[PDB]
Amino acid sequence: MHHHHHHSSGVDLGTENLYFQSNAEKTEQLLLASANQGNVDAQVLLAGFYWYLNTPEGYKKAFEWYQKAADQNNADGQYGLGYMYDTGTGVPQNSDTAMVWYKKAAEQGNSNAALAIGYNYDTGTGVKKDKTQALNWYAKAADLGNASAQYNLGLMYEQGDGVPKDYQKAAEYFEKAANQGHAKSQLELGYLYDSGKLGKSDLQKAAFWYQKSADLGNANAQFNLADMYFYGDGVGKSLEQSVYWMQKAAEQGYGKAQNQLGIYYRDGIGVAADPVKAYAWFTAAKNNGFEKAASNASDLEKSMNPEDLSKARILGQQYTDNYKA
Ligand code: NI
Ligand code: NI
Asked: Helical H runs in 232-305?
């Protein structure tokens, strides 16, 4: 009498092909077959498979298999146990147990283990803060090629944290990490060149490294590069490229970039002027904590008719919702 409205409807209706299957169960059984025969490489792979399920039961099985691998003296298994104990993942948190496993792994040349140890000394989590120990363990990890450790040492020499400030040494560490694709190191190295702190500003190098970090999705680097194109710093001035990169940063919810893009639309910089879009970007910026955007939005209201203001406020909500870090 009304249940004629219960028929299924497209989306939850339609013939099923290979798109609806999943390889998960098959990959687990393939890995389990080998892991249950004692193959340590398979035990490490299977532990990582379980790790990736992000469930409490998944982390408990990850722990079981890293343990089997670590009992064969495998440094990946030892690192895995170290990290699980250190964070209380799949097992009760214990920093001292974690340190024992990390040290075994690092002695075998696992650079993430050396990094984790250095980080605990750096921050005093589980052990007493000791910047000398942090420095030594980070240096071990960096000499094994670990980009995060190289980055961390860059930060320490650039800030003088437990070492005397040395921007040249910082730039050398950052560049090792930057050459491996570490986007935050590329950003920091770009800034060192931008700033002149190395002796004389090198804006071409700054823009080069900001572009690398921007291509990897770093919103600060996208803002910085957009700004380089606005000024013609180390690249030829291009308002069109400035808009392109500013829009990328603003679509990550970066309030500073949203406000700047609002200015571009307000004043017709690299784009045709559009008060509706300008107001919407200032609104998103304000919603994201950029206080100066609020008055930017206020000032625009004065010159916008009520239809446009309504559309702008709705678009501003859309931009707030859809653009996140
Ligand atoms: Ni009915
Ligand atoms: Ni009906």
From this structure: 239-250, 255-267, 275-287, 292-301
